[PDB]
Design a protein around this nucleic acid. Structure first.
Lengths: 50, 123, 50, 50
RNA sequence: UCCGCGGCGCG
DNA sequence: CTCTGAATCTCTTCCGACGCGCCGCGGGACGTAC
DNA sequence: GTACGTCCGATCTTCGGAAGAGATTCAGAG
């Protein structure tokens, strides 16, 4: 049911929504979206567990 | 691109007292990425009123509006990202945030004519 | 209050009034030079926020 | 007491963004649209006529 | 100099 | 069909005891000249 | 080193409890 309620079924579209709700007002281009996503949980500089 | 639209001026906000280094930084960011066709020229209005005495002497720099600087960007996405990527820059100003609003051409011509007579009383 | 040293303990009311009067003076100066419409709209928004 | 000659009119917060919006329900409007109109994002019509 | 913030303590 | 409508879910605000003693920090930074 | 004019960009993340206003919803007459 969680997948049923999913509004979109595209990885690019998913990056679009995550980029939109990360901070509102910005048009969702793919390059900026992927750069932002790679710098939230997968970048050694702004994210690390001791 | 396929179309040939005029590179009409846009307005981008910057910190007061930091305009010069902001403009220079735009110059090196547009130079290093090597898109000289995408961007034209950047300039901020500046006045040079000279007074012999009374504190400041022989020169005084005044700006009609200090917080804003004009650029020659074109309606795109990568170029706008490059504009916002420069530090000490907040963003575009206009009627709507999603697409920055442009500036009227007739008042651009009027302000250019006004700026064509900056030089007064030489030497 | 002129406390010890060459310093002043400025109340927040003085700072708020100084900001508001500075914005008003800048807008009044800018309105007599026929500034672009977007510029005066943004400055009016800043004054209203202040 | 002194006065500051405001160059442009401004709206009072106490009469705008309280729990009941005075101006909003006086003009039969919600709060979001009047907030958008006052912060220079959208136009409003006066005397539409024909 | 008479104001603000933070901390500790006594009722 | 479609509009209404009463109920329901969601978002925004304000409230949280009273006296006293002591100590320590408070517009700071940033360019522009002198 | 020091007096003086000017000025307000990087990033946050852990309360119940209630009271009220606004958006949603589905229920129904039909």
């Amino acid at each position: 049911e969680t997948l049923r309620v999913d509004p979109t079924n595209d990885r690019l579209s998913a990056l679009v929504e995550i980029y939109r709700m990360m901070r509102p007002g910005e048009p969702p281009t793919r390059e900026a979206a992927e750069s932002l996503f790679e710098n939230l949980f997968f970048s050694e500089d702004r994210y690390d567990l001791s | 691109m396929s179309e040939a639209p005029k590179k009409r001026w846009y307005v981008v906000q910057a910190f007061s007292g930091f305009e010069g280094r902001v403009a220079t930084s735009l110059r090196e960011h547009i130079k290093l990425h090597n898109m000289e066709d995408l961007f034209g020229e950047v300039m901020v209005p500046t006045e040079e009123v000279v007074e012999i005495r009374g504190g400041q002497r022989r020169k005084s720099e005044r700006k009609f509006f200090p917080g804003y600087v004009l650029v020659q960007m074109v309606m795109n996405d990568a170029s706008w990202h490059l504009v916002r990527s420069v530090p000490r820059v907040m963003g575009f100003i206009g009627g709507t945030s999603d697409r920055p609003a442009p500036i009227s051409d007739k008042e651009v011509d009027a302000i250019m004519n006004r700026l064509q007579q900056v030089g007064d009383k030489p030497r | 209050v002129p406390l010890d040293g060459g310093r002043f303990a400025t109340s927040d009311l003085n700072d708020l009034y100084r900001r508001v009067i500075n914005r008003n003076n800048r807008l009044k100066r800018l309105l007599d030079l026929a500034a672009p419409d977007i510029i005066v709209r943004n400055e009016k928004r800043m004054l209203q926020e202040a | 007491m002194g006065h500051i000659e405001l160059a442009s009119p401004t709206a009072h917060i106490w009469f705008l963004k309280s729990l009941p919006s005075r101006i909003g329900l006086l003009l039969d409007m919600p709060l979001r649209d009047i907030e958008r109109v006052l912060y220079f994002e959208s136009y409003v019509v006066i005397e539409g006529g024909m």
